[PDB]
Amino acid sequence: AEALSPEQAAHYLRYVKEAKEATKNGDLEEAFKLFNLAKDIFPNEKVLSRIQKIQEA
Amino acid sequence: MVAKFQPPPEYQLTAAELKQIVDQSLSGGDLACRLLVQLFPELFSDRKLESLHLQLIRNYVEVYYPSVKDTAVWQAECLPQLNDFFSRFWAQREMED
């Protein structure tokens, strides 16, 4: 199942960068969406590792 | 012979993490490019495909493609693919604007 294209990598990397910044800011909604778009291109333990979909609400 | 070499913690993958990347990899060369992306995302933000970086990738690749221990195999399959992946990524970025 498929070679990673540079286009895919670029999208993957921008998504992770922005998901991290979103997490720093506290917008977990955006982080969750972005980490998932990353997972859809290139799934891996570190990304799936959020999750950390914690709430108490 | 000489020592135990380990990479820095930030570039250390678990066997589980390595297996997963391999399972998605179409070839030795694709594995090498996926590894570049996972280990060295700093190389894609605002070249430094330098020897230490490439050797680290090759060490991981060799776990599942042991013929890559032959430098000819490395230079025939993986290394042109890594460089062309990296060139393509940067030209694509240059062109965005």
Query: CB neighbours of B28 closer than 8 A, spacing ≥ 6?
Result: B61, B65, B68, B73, B77, B78
Q: For residue A7, list chain B residues with Cβ-Cβ distance below 8 A.
A: 92
Task: Print the domain residue range for B27.
Answer: 1-97
For this entry, resolution in Å reads: 2.2
Which method, experimentally, gave rise to this model?
X-ray
Domain count, chain B: 1
- Identify the closest residue of chain B to A48 by CA–CA distance: B17
Closest CB to A12: pick one of B14, B24, B37: B37
State how far the alpha carbon of B96 is from the alpha carbons of A10, B41, B65, B91, in Å. Answer: 12, 19, 36, 9
Taking alpha carbons only, the member of A3, A8, A12, A41 closest to residue B27 is: A3
What is d(CA B86, CA A13) in angstroms, rounded to the nearest whole number?
Answer: 13
Query: CB neighbours of A54 closer than 8 A, spacing ≥ 6?
Result: none
Q: For residue B80, list chain A residues with Cβ-Cβ distance below 8 A.
A: none
